Amino acid sequence: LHKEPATLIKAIDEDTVKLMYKGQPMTFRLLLVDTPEFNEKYGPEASAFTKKMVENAKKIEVEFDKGQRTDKYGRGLAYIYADGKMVNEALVRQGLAKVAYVYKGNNTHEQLLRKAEAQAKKEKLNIWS
Ligand SMILES: Cc1cn([C@H]2C[C@H](OP(=O)(O)O)[C@@H](COP(=O)(O)O)O2)c(=O)[nH]c1=O
Ligand SMILES: [Ca+2]
């Protein structure tokens, strides 16, 4: 897999973000995660955490997997990195997301995120509390 440049346009919500990628505005949906909605418990905190992570980054990168790169809504499907730290993994590690939406061929970092979820769960963090 390869990391590619992008720039923040706007944080959106818990697990989507609007990035400029190859010069074009796109909404990205984070691979391999599911989050609470804004009006559910831990939704605001997921949203805030994603927002902070992307807004505070000096370098955003986009890493596509081996499979589908856009979903049925036109959202890009990637692993997103903020100063080298994976946002998808960070949300899971903090118990603000669960591993989810694991489709075959777009699952290179599954076991990495499952490990993260396991540690968040052990720690009883947030959604696991
Ligand atoms: C994360 C992800 C979501 N999706 C689709 C499946 C879900 O369809 P439905 O809308 O029909 O449920 C939806 C969940 O996204 P959200 O969790 O952002 O709603 O996005 C993919 O197709 N591939 C993916 O990798
Ligand atoms: Ca949502």
47: CATH: 2.40.50.90
29 is catalytic: yes
CA distance 13 to 15: 6
> Could you give the angle at the alpha carbon of 26 between the alpha carbons of 15 and 115, nearest 5°?
30
Q: Which residues contact 109 (CB under 8 A, 6 or more apart)?
A: 31, 32, 65, 79, 86, 88, 89
Domains identified in the chain, total number: 1
Asked if residue 64 lies in contact with residue 55, where contact means CB atoms within 8 angstroms, the answer is no
CB 75 within 8 A of CB 15: no
Q: Which residue(s) pair with 5 in the sheet?
A: 61
What residues make up the domain containing 94? 1-129
Assign 3-class secondary structure to 65-106.
CCCCCECCCCCEEEEEEECCEEHHHHHHHCCCCEECCCCCCC
Strand partners, 17: 11, 28
Catalytic residue from among 14, 29, 61, 93: 29
Q: Which residues line ligand 1 (CB under 6 A)?
A: 15, 29, 31, 34, 71-72, 77, 101, 103, 106
Q: Are strands 76-82 and 24-30 parallel, antiparallel or unpaired?
A: parallel
Nearest residue (CA) to ligand 1, atom 2? 101
- The resolution in Å comes to 1.9
